[PDB]
């Protein structure tokens, strides 16, 4: 339903549904590195650690469950080669804090995208808007996105799906919670 | 509309590196690896202007044209002006996977496989065009991955790319009078192709190898 | 290998041939298994049998040819800071020889590059033995 | 597939010879045959890199392009820098069967039959292309034979081939101040044809005239 | 029977049979320099020392006499311009130890081919394999192989036929012997 | 090479090679129950314990490695529904002594086929003869062989491959050994 083909390119059907995250009024955001998220689940993960090689696209579906009395806006953006950065040190991020698996991570500074760039300009990447008063779902189709024709799934994350609440969730009660469900369906997985 | 093309936007010569070195009768072990020569790994993420301009894209593919400008001067004034004797300099492009010189008289200077250019100070600046040297189809400005297969690898360092290393030495055997020579390297990307534009950098850079931000 | 050490990036497929040089009536079976680069070298016969393998009966065929699939050595961990694939042999059965023949037999292996091989970025070969000055050098061209 | 052709594989300029020589007022008999000039028989089996690369074939046919790079310097510093006076050098190619000079002022320097080039230090390096100089159709990298008809001949020395001899001198009459000049010779084979490839050398070389091995 | 044309070139019928050599379990190998081998026998030798000139190809046949209970492998390789070398000195090999006549010589270091190269790469030369369990004969046809159109047979050996046991001869008894017969037939001898 | 289609019916290509057995002069025989043999190896075993269901044929290749000085005859027979029996008791054979896995079992009484029938009449089953003086290999193609259209691989063995030396192995020495290699290739495995 109104999918977004990234960069105007259209490259199975398992739709690995990750554990839903809780959107609170103080949430900063969540991110998943696409090859790493599915590296430990399903036939995708089994084939990934069976072979030294991998080549495929992705299909992303993000859905929220909220009532008509809820308000908020989400930016569902897929960042290619989202090389993260540290906040107050010159040392590079480590393997533990980069490869978060299917659990994913949270944005420390969503304003600067944990990269030092601007969130306001993040719309240049393939993205969709989830405004709770108009829609509650977003679908993005991701192409190959690699300089090399071949890649190592266990060492390089080609895509990073980021969900950032631009407008915080709100309702009459001071505490609000709205589940967010992320489903990833690799296509032509190798 | 032609001025704002990517090729015109990025193809501007810039002082990628500038490093002077003395050469006075360096028979002793004074200033190891700086006796009469200097080396510079060819990396584009050295000056913040070029960093911010190039980091507007995810993948780049270009040929680097290098012009070397050398000047010689002395502040000692131990004798008359007597002019400046004409020195011949050797600039050798050592690509990745090859051995770089460690001393001014190392046998790597006469390898016969590494491309080398010999030019004089009085001559116009030497120009060479380094082609697209990458095993992949494009350079990775940003790399969301780890170099080595072991977990001790560095984040963001692509073992691909790595254009190469540039070494410059004074060919002349050390003359009785020492001299200070300054070599300026200007790189101008050519035939540039860019993919996947990215938000501009907003915070000051913290390191040449990390995307770390202050704040 | 000698020619490839003159270059930096190599890519293509290799072909291996193994020749059995025992007596005419010597019989037995060997297992030749190929391990892809993203894997561990097998240590036991049944573990090797799981992957791509050839059961070679040298009592019938004196030579067997194994074709290694296309591999890019440039991408696969060339000083990226070698598990690029293995070919192992296991003794499926015992070696049976007539009483008049020798109790020991030998194997000879060959390697060649297919027509799809590619070499790029020529460099200086390090296996020359390094530059030492030779005798009668200065006296040759006084 | 073009990079791995024989022409590209072998046609790389290499420092075949490098030999400095003093020239200070050599009126006396000091350093005979080294007073103000040096000679070098043009043989390709001088540097181990080129030896191993060329010895991959049995027969070769190529034209040698010679570029001469000369630098002048002094460590005495008996006076001010005063620059380096421009010296003119003569490089004469003496082919086989011709007489080579024995002294700097020998009449062979003005033979009129041996090809000679006059160049200045401040000028760019001098380049000359020596053609295929052999009585046979190809050079013999390996020669399973004896040169002379008598049994005292040398093994492996072909009386054919023998490209020639290259002599370089300073044309200027000895100036009051002596100087050290270093001449670098770079040879780059061109239009190369190769026959009968051979196994690569595996043992370190023992001599420039023998295929002797250590071990 | 299954001849090998060297370098794919096909350039009389006397077939001078040399004295058979004995293949033992400890043999290192044998070599014959082709112009020198026939320089002292037959009409070839008479014409060779009658004239100052010579130009012709060669035909080589190597045969072994062994039973089905013998094992071993031979490399029958023809090396063009096999310039030999000494083992532990800087002096060149002499006339006596180079020109061995029809008797031939033996390899001191077959691993390095007495040249300093590798035996493993000697297959680049025209060669045939004699594996006693499959075949016992090898035939090689040798072209002119000279840079000059003309040659002196008494000073230059254009070809060197080498027979090297890669796999040593073996049988139940610790001592084994198998005769090897070499026949050379110059073609269009001058 | 001269395969035997069982009952004239012709119903992948992995050819799971079991560990070779040693044919001695006093060997009684070896048997493997076909579904059970591959139940713990390869994609066949993985699919077998993944699903509750299985349906496929089989391809059997038996090979011996012996010299021309060896003698002996083998009966390679595939027995459908080979319900074994005990020797001196009224209790049924147990799971441990019926399901031997890929290791297989040995015949206690090859004369009566461990069933109480006759070995002499076992030729009524699909079979091939391995007479060492004429041939050393046997190939049998086995059909579905089940009353039901569907079967449970973990509880019912449809085929039992039996190798029985009718004529004992012999040579000049009183002790003889000849390896026997069994390869099973299930076809259209489910």
């Amino acid at each position: 339903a109104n999918y977004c083909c990234a960069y105007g390119e259209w490259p199975t059907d398992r739709f690995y549904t990750l554990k839903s995250v809780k959107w609170e009024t103080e949430s900063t955001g969540w991110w998943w590195k696409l090859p790493d998220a599915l590296n430990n689940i399903g036939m995708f993960g089994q084939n990934v650690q069976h072979h030294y090689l991998y080549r495929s696209g992705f299909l992303i579906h993000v859905q929220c469950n909220a009532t008509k009395f809820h308000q908020g806006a989400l930016l569902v953006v897929a960042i290619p080669e989202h090389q993260r950065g540290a906040h107050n040190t010159t040392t590079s991020p480590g393997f533990d804090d980069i490869m978060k698996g299917e659990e994913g991570g949270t944005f420390n500074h969503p304003y600067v995208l944990d990269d030092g760039t601007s969130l306001a300009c993040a719309t240049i990447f393939p993205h969709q808007w989830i405004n709770l008063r108009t829609n509650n779902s977003a679908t993005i189709v991701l192409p190959w996105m690699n300089a090399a024709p071949m890649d190592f799934p266990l060492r390089h994350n080609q895509w990073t799906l980021a969900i950032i609440p631009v407008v915080p969730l709100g309702t009459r009660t001071v505490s609000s919670m709205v589940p967010i469900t992320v489903s990833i369906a690799p296509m032509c997985c190798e | 509309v032609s001025e704002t093309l990517v090729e015109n936007f990025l193809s501007r010569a810039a002082l990628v590196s500038k490093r002077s070195f003395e050469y006075k009768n360096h028979t002793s072990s004074e200033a190891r690896t700086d006796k009469n020569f200097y080396k510079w790994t060819i990396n584009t993420k050295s000056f913040v202007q070029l960093r911010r301009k190039l980091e507007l894209f995810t993948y780049l593919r270009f040929d680097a044209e290098i012009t070397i400008l050398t000047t010689v001067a002395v502040g000692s004034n131990n004798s008359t002006y007597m002019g400046l004797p004409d020195l011949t300099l050797q600039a050798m492009f050592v690509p990745t996977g090859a051995l770089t010189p460690e001393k001014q008289d190392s046998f790597h200077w006469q390898s016969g496989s590494n491309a080398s250019v010999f030019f004089k100070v009085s001559d116009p600046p030497a120009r060479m065009t380094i082609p697209f040297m990458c095993i992949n189809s494009a350079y990775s400005v940003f790399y969301d991955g780890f170099a080595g297969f072991e977990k001790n690898g560095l984040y963001g360092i692509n073992p691909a790319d790595t254009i190469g290393n540039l070494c410059v030495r004074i060919v002349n055997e050390h003359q009785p009078i020492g001299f200070t020579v300054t070599v300026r390297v200007y790189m101008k990307p050519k035939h540039i192709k860019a993919w996947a534009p990215r938000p501009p950098r907003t915070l000051p850079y913290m390191s040449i190898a990390n995307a770390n931000y202050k704040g | 290998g000698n020619i490839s050490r003159y270059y930096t990036h190599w890519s293509g497929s290799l072909e291996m041939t193994f020749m059995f040089c025992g007596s005419f009536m010597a019989t037995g079976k060997l297992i030749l298994c190929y391990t892809p680069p993203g894997g561990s070298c097998p240590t036991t016969r049944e573990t090797a049998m799981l992957g791509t393998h050839i059961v070679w009966d040298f009592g019938l065929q004196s030579s067997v040819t194994l074709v290694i699939p296309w591999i890019s050595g440039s991408h696969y961990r060339m000083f990226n800071n070698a598990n690029v694939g293995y070919v192992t042999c296991f003794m499926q059965t015992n070696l049976i020889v007539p009483s008049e023949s020798s109790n020991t037999c030998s194997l000879i292996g060959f390697v060649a590059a297919k027509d799809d091989f590619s070499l790029r970025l020529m460099r200086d070969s390090p296996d020359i033995g390094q530059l030492e000055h030779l005798h009668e050098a200065e006296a040759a061209y006084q």
Side-chain angles (χ1 to χ4, degrees), chain A, chain B, chain C:
Chain A
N2 183 24
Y3 49 57
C4 169
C5 292
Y7 297 124
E9 256 65 77
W10 198 99
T12 59
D13 204 26
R14 270 276 330 151
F15 263 119
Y16 304 86
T17 294
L18 319 181
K19 282 317 118 195
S20 294
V21 295
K22 288 150 100 83
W23 182 8
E24 319 254 26
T25 73
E26 51 295 22
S27 324
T28 61
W30 315 262
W31 53 267
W32 295 267
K33 302 195 169 303
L34 271 200
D36 181 36
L38 320 176
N39 264 356
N40 212 14
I41 54 170
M43 50 66 168
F44 184 100
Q46 328 326 137
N47 304 359
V48 147
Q49 98 289 289
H50 282 147
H51 321 300
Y52 299 163
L53 282 202
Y54 161 67
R55 199 238 51 81
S56 91
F58 289 98
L59 180 40
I60 311 299
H61 180 82
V62 176
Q63 178 126 53
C64 316
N65 285 291
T67 71
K68 290 174 132 33
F69 302 109
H70 283 103
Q71 71 184 33
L74 285 169
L75 179 54
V76 181
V77 56
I79 308 155
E81 309 272 3
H82 184 224
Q83 176 177 342
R84 306 179 42 87
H87 164 245
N88 216 352
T89 174
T90 57
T91 178
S92 288
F95 201 92
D96 56 2
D97 54 49
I98 284 306
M99 300 298 230
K100 286 306 206 332
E102 92 310 5
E103 166 86 350
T106 63
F107 277 94
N108 320 118
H109 307 86
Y111 185 49
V112 305
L113 269 188
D114 293 3
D115 170 352
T117 56
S118 88
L119 168 67
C121 306
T123 54
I124 196 163
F125 293 135
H127 75 289
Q128 289 235 307
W129 280 100
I130 297 189
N131 190 16
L132 283 192
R133 91 193 309 257
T134 54
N135 63 323
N136 61 344
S137 64
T139 300
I140 313 186
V141 178
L142 295 189
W144 170 228
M145 212 37 33
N146 192 42
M150 214 40 222
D151 198 349
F152 311 114
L154 299 171
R155 317 222 56 73
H156 175 240
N157 309 295
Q158 315 189 0
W159 284 105
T160 294
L161 169 79
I163 303 172
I164 307 175
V166 173
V167 168
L169 187 77
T171 203
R172 202 31 82 92
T173 75
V174 80
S175 96
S176 298
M177 192 306 258
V178 159
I180 304 182
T181 298
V182 184
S183 321
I184 302 104
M187 317 177 321
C188 301
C189 54
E190 213 276 345
Chain B
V1 83
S2 69
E3 163 140 56
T4 189
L5 291 162
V6 185
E7 171 93 17
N8 302 348
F9 179 73
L10 290 172
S11 73
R12 307 294 285 254
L15 182 60
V16 287
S17 77
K18 161 186 176 302
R19 194 141 33 178
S20 63
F21 58 90
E22 239 286 3
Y23 100 101
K24 42 150 297 182
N25 293 358
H26 271 74
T27 65
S28 305
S29 297
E30 321 174 351
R32 187 76 281 282
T33 69
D34 324 284
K35 289 167 162 54
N36 307 265
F37 90 107
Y38 101 102
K39 88 155 53 66
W40 169 70
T41 65
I42 302 160
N43 93 98
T44 51
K45 33 166 46 187
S46 46
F47 278 68
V48 285
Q49 285 293 324
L50 196 58
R51 281 206 65 173
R52 194 156 180 288
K53 294 192 59 180
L54 292 180
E55 286 185 346
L56 291 178
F57 313 94
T58 311
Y59 300 121
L60 284 169
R61 182 190 175 103
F62 58 88
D63 321 329
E65 141 172 331
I66 289 61
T67 84
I68 310 177
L69 205 149
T70 84
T71 64
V72 55
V74 57
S76 170
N77 294 353
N78 31 244
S79 302
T80 175
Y81 167 60
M82 212 204 165
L84 304 320
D86 224 21
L87 310 178
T88 63
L89 313 187
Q90 171 179 13
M92 193 172 38
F93 167 57
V94 187
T96 175
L99 280 72
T100 71
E102 65 313 343
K103 51 185 188 300
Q104 191 241 348
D105 50 353
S106 79
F107 72 104
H108 298 112
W109 286 112
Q110 56 203 42
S111 82
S113 305
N114 304 346
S116 177
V117 54
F118 295 89
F119 54 94
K120 324 174 69 59
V121 180
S122 306
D123 261 11
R127 311 106 161 171
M128 26 168 48
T129 299
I130 298 177
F132 175 58
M133 305 258 312
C134 178
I135 73 182
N136 302 327
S137 297
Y139 296 121
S140 301
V141 190
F142 293 93
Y143 190 69
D144 195 356
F146 291 84
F149 294 96
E150 90 308 337
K151 293 212 318 173
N152 268 57
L154 282 318
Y155 185 47
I157 312 297
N158 196 359
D161 312 11
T162 317
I163 298 177
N165 207 328
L166 181 67
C167 317
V168 172
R169 67 154 180 171
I170 302 181
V171 179
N172 303 18
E173 168 297 338
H174 67 43
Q175 294 292 341
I177 173 60
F179 259 135
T180 46
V181 312
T182 308
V183 282
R184 288 176 166 81
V185 180
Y186 291 78
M187 171 214 284
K188 174 175 173 295
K190 315 197 70 169
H191 320 282
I192 308 162
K193 282 178 171 295
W195 299 268
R198 318 184 51 109
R201 177 92 178 185
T202 58
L203 272 307
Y205 288 102
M206 269 208 167
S207 143
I208 65 107
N210 306 349
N212 294 11
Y213 51 92
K214 174 52 210 61
Chain C
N2 272 306
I3 303 306
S4 292
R5 255 173 265 105
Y6 274 107
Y7 291 79
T8 312
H9 310 305
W10 68 269
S11 147
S13 46
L14 297 177
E15 151 164 336
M16 306 208 170
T17 299
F18 299 92
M19 209 180 36
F20 181 73
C21 304
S23 39
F24 179 85
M25 320 213 327
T27 37
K29 285 173 172 293
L30 299 173
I31 298 191
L32 278 170
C33 59
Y34 163 60
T35 281
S40 300
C41 174
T43 54
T44 73
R45 191 203 55 88
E46 66 291 337
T47 45
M49 200 249 303
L50 306 186
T52 70
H53 72 271
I54 295 179
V55 176
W56 176 26
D57 192 317
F58 53 80
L60 152 82
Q61 223 172 25
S62 299
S63 300
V64 74
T65 302
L66 178 64
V67 174
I68 270 68
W70 183 94
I71 170 67
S72 169
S74 36
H75 282 101
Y76 261 100
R77 304 225 148 188
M78 173 171 0
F79 35 80
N80 57 345
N81 46 350
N83 198 7
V84 197
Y86 296 68
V87 167
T88 84
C89 196
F90 290 99
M91 274 225 79
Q92 161 69 30
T93 75
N94 273 324
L95 168 75
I96 271 74
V97 293
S99 174
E100 265 254 5
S101 288
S102 177
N103 275 351
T104 309
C105 299
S106 299
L107 274 175
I108 290 316
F110 305 95
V111 64
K114 312 291 291 311
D115 40 358
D116 68 334
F117 221 82
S118 167
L119 299 167
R120 283 165 38 197
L121 197 51
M122 149 150 80
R123 55 170 182 177
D124 294 7
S125 198
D127 55 357
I128 62 146
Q130 155 70 243
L131 171 57
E132 295 41 40
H133 69 90
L134 308 179
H135 309 84
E136 313 137 353
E138 279 69 26
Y141 37 65
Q142 298 102 0

